[PDB]
Amino acid sequence: QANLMRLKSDLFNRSPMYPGPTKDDPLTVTLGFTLQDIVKVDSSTNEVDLVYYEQQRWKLNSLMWDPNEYGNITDFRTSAADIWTPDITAYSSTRPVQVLSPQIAVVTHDGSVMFIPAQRLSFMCDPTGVDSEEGVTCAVKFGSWVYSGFEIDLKTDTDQVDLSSYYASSKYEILSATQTRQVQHYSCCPEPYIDVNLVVKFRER
Amino acid sequence: QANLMRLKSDLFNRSPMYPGPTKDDPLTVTLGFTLQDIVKVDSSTNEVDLVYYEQQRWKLNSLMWDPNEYGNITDFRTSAADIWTPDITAYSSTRPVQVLSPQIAVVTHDGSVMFIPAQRLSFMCDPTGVDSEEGVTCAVKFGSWVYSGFEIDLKTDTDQVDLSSYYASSKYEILSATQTRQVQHYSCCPEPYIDVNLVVKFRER
Amino acid sequence: QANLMRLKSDLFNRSPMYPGPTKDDPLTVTLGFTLQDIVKVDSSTNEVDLVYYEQQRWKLNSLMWDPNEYGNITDFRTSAADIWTPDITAYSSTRPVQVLSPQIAVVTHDGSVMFIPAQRLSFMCDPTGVDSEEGVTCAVKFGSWVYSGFEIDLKTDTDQVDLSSYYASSKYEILSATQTRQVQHYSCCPEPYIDVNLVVKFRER
Amino acid sequence: QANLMRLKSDLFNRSPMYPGPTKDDPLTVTLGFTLQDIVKVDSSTNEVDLVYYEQQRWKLNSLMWDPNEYGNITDFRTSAADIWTPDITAYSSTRPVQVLSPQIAVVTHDGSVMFIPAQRLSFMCDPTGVDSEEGVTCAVKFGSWVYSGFEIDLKTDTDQVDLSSYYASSKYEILSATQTRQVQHYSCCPEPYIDVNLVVKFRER
Amino acid sequence: QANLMRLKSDLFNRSPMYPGPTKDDPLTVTLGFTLQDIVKVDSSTNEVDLVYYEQQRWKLNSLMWDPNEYGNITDFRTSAADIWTPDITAYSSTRPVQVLSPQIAVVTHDGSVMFIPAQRLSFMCDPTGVDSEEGVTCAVKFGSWVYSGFEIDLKTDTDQVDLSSYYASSKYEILSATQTRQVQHYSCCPEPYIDVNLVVKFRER
Ligand SMILES: O=C(O[C@H]1C[C@H]2CC[C@@H](C1)N2C[C@H](O)c1ccccc1)c1ccccc1
Ligand SMILES: O=C(O[C@H]1C[C@H]2CC[C@@H](C1)N2C[C@H](O)c1ccccc1)c1ccccc1
Ligand SMILES: O=C(O[C@H]1C[C@H]2CC[C@@H](C1)N2C[C@H](O)c1ccccc1)c1ccccc1
Ligand SMILES: O=C(O[C@H]1C[C@H]2CC[C@@H](C1)N2C[C@H](O)c1ccccc1)c1ccccc1
Ligand SMILES: O=C(O[C@H]1C[C@H]2CC[C@@H](C1)N2C[C@H](O)c1ccccc1)c1ccccc1
Ligand SMILES: [Cl-]
Ligand SMILES: [Cl-]
Ligand SMILES: [Cl-]
Ligand SMILES: [Cl-]
Ligand SMILES: [Cl-]
Ligand SMILES: [Cl-]
Ligand SMILES: [Cl-]
Ligand SMILES: [Cl-]
Ligand SMILES: [Cl-]
Ligand SMILES: [Cl-]
Ligand SMILES: [Cl-]
Ligand SMILES: [Cl-]
């Protein structure tokens, strides 16, 4: 255990704190969604609840090491409190997001980080026509709140949201689920801002 | 990254803590509102829920630097925990305000600070006549709870509320919305207190 | 700002922790109420909700200074976390009190402290006859949970509650509201305990 | 105040942490209940809500002192965070207990500790027949979750629950209320476990 | 008490932090369930609430000692905050789990740890046919969120869930209850992940 304890000590306690991405040192984050369930729809306030888990991937030079020097260690698990994390937020949320999983991430010797947080979200969506055979469609945007496109960029490995873990006896059937990257231009700010737009079509079971 | 790490170290770790504005050395905060949605109205308790995001701007001499000495760095992002923030509160709230965005602010080399917090608020408002063609009007005041006029002052760049991001399929239509500065005298206290009055006119879609 | 930073350093960091009033060092706290609104009444559980703000005043010798020695500073604002505060509680509450304002207090050079906390409270009250012209009356007691009369005493500047900020379009009109000091003798303890009784008479709008 | 500050420093900062009771060195806790109100009964889930305050008494040799050596000080108030406290829990609760009072305890020169916490509790109880003249009866057990009988023992000064502070206009009348000590044997574990069973008989007013 | 204080000091303060299991130093956790009550079923969102307590057992070499050297001490109780704990999570939860018991664990001289946490959980379950004589069946999986099989394995002493403490007057009758170990293979990852599946059969009184 001595080698892992030493590597951790050298990485986090010796060196100073990482101050995030800049225009000179930008980074890209890969996003992915696994939809688990549509728990409820509120027709009187136009609010819809989702249960899912997000995939977050990024790489930093400040986090890499030589495995040979630390007794052939390629990777390790660490609390998300010990490392820098991106600030990915939902634009149309109506209540604070609830966390449903432990906050631990995995770090590999090349500097790659993987973080998989599970959560419940309430957002703006009109459910009129969910009782029909054709169904109703809704969308929600995810992205960094404070950083532009010159500091953080976003990427998706596929445009098909993972439905391999969707609840079979849910009150609502999934007709389509997509994850597409998009660019925005805001009046306030002269820089573009990048997002990933989650679009879902569904109906009553 | 060494230069940004150095600037941050010199600003926050070397010098002591800023003890807030005084009567001798006072400051001014600029406010602005972006209304997103009227989620629900409760006719039985006269309570109304609002989802929006606030614009906060102030300047401090203790936060400025020469970009030339720190490798031509003009600005940076930092956690709101690291810097002093104004104590802006709503006078007619009925439940504690819910935060819906990350707490990160931006600092420029001249000492200017920008902070944009997203939140949900419940306040006192009679909705009688929202079902009419003319609609109903309500208001809520914002300002520093503990600081007087001789300590903190308020300013608005415009009188019109930003409605460019208002939810298109909301159950309620916005007829008018304004942000206007006020100066008040309370019975308790011999000093005046400044606030910004948010007045919204709406009806059923 | 150097003088205020120095005064604060000398008061809180040099000297040791204040261990609360004793029988050889007792203190008196002044109380006062500003009623804002009666939000709801529950006839099925006999519970009533209130929104208001309290006035707290006390003096300590450990907090006084000479303004002349610290560049003519008479007073300053500080987080309630930095100073000792009285343990004032409501005897008939049914749910934990919600805080609705920042926790900042003001300290003057003579050692006087002023703290104004805003809050929402749920307490025991039978609302039978609120629909009548005569209305219904209810009461709630406030005071120190642990400290007796030989450690902490209470005082009120007036016996009339401040109704100058009561919500005009509330579902309930106030007929009368009063604040009066009481001395209680409990079976548990040979010492007496001091409290202030808030009595409100109201009816439907 | 110098003497009290000194005594506190010598007790908590000089000596090491108390590691809780053992087999070779056990202790006894005295319990007592003051019933304030039965707030609501839920016939659809068989859940009942109670508002009350508990009496906790224990003695430790590590907490005693000579008053003569510390300027004739017999007792003092201290935050429950500074001292060891027993882990008394409710076996049939359905939601986490809500605290309704400050967490301060009193310590005397002989080593005796007194702690009086006020709280709201939801537990399993079938209310069928509360509308009858005979009424309905329910019970709930309190005791240490982790320590057996060979480490912690329990005691009651009386078997008659204190009803001198029960809410006069409650929707429910108290017929009888008792506090009795019990010794349990669980299938899992070879040691005996002690508890105090609270039994209440009530009906509609 | 000097010996126990010394043992605790030598174990936690002298040696460095345990960095969690690895492929070179893996461990196994034993699980067990005691079902207490089915509090409510929501047919409109397909959500079910459970109240129970879990059994957790694991062994570490970093936690063993010679009783002879520490005055014949075989075991002791300690706060779960002082030791490493497994990240055992429910896959189909819809709201954050509520804790209903103190967080204390027991450590024996051979390095074995026992932790018994009590909790309330809301998960995905279709209750259609609970009103029938045959009843309805539902399931939920438990296991570590981040560690694979080569780091954490699971075990059960029996396949029958403990029903000796199930609430007699519950609105729902239990007909069956089993705990069974499973091995999952995920696309994302190259190692197999283990879980323990909880299956309950029930109906209305
Ligand atoms: O910088 C600002 O806002 C931040 C940048 C953008 C715009 C609002 C919010 C905060 N950011 C949105 C973010 O890019 C986002 C977009 C879509 C989904 C998630 C996050 C700003 C806006 C108005 C006035 C002054 C400053
Ligand atoms: O300082 C006081 O009041 C504080 C200052 C002002 C007045 C009430 C509240 C607390 N503060 C209001 C603040 O100026 C404000 C106004 C409008 C919207 C938000 C905050 C005070 C109150 C009662 C007795 C003694 C002193
Ligand atoms: O010290 C006790 O309780 C404290 C003293 C009194 C009684 C309850 C509570 C805590 N104190 C009441 C408090 O002074 C108060 C009364 C009314 C409104 C607010 C606070 C006590 C009670 C019963 C048995 C042994 C000790
Ligand atoms: O020690 C255990 O549980 C603790 C001891 C007992 C049994 C459950 C709970 C926790 N304890 C009950 C406790 O004595 C109690 C009883 C009544 C009211 C409060 C606490 C245990 C249970 C099952 C398998 C292995 C170990
Ligand atoms: O490693 C991953 O996720 C972890 C492994 C598995 C799958 C989700 C979660 C985190 N783990 C589930 C866990 O094994 C579990 C299974 C059953 C009950 C509780 C926990 C992952 C998932 C998607 C894309 C890239 C990487
Ligand atoms: Cl709900
Ligand atoms: Cl920003
Ligand atoms: Cl709601
Ligand atoms: Cl409500
Ligand atoms: Cl103030
Ligand atoms: Cl929107
Ligand atoms: Cl007390
Ligand atoms: Cl309620
Ligand atoms: Cl409920
Ligand atoms: Cl145990
Ligand atoms: Cl870990
Ligand atoms: Cl992972």
TrEMBL record, chains A, B, C, D, E:
- Positions that bind Mg(2+) 2: 75, 151
- One Pfam family cited in the UniProt record for this chain: Neur_chan_LBD
Q: Which Gene3D superfamilies does the protein's record reference?
A: Neurotransmitter-gated ion-channel ligand-binding domain
- Start and end of every Neurotransmitter-gated ion-channel ligand-binding domain? 16-203
Record: residues binding Mg(2+) 6: 185
Q: Where does Mg(2+) 4 bind?
A: 148, 151
The GO molecular function terms of this record are: extracellular ligand-gated monoatomic ion channel activity; identical protein binding; metal ion binding; transmembrane signaling receptor activity
Q: Which GO terms describe its cellular component?
A: membrane
Q: Which residues make up the binding site for Mg(2+) 5? A: 151, 191
Domain of life of the organism encoding this protein: Eukaryota
Spell out the InterPro entries in the cross-references: Neur_chan_lig-bd, Neur_chan_lig-bd_sf, Neur_channel
Which Cys residues form disulphide pairs? 125-138, 188-189
Where, in this chain's numbering, is Ca(2+) bound?
164
Q: Which keywords accompany this UniProt record?
A: Calcium, Metal-binding, Receptor, Signal
Q: Which positions does UniProt annotate for Mg(2+) 3 binding?
A: 75, 191
Q: Does the keyword Ribosomal protein apply?
A: no
Q: Which residues are glycosylated?
A: 72
Which PANTHER family does the annotation name?
A: NEUROTRANSMITTER GATED ION CHANNEL
Can you name this protein? Answer: Soluble acetylcholine receptor
Protein species of origin: Aplysia californica (California sea hare)
State the organism's lineage.
Eukaryota, Metazoa, Spiralia, Lophotrochozoa, Mollusca
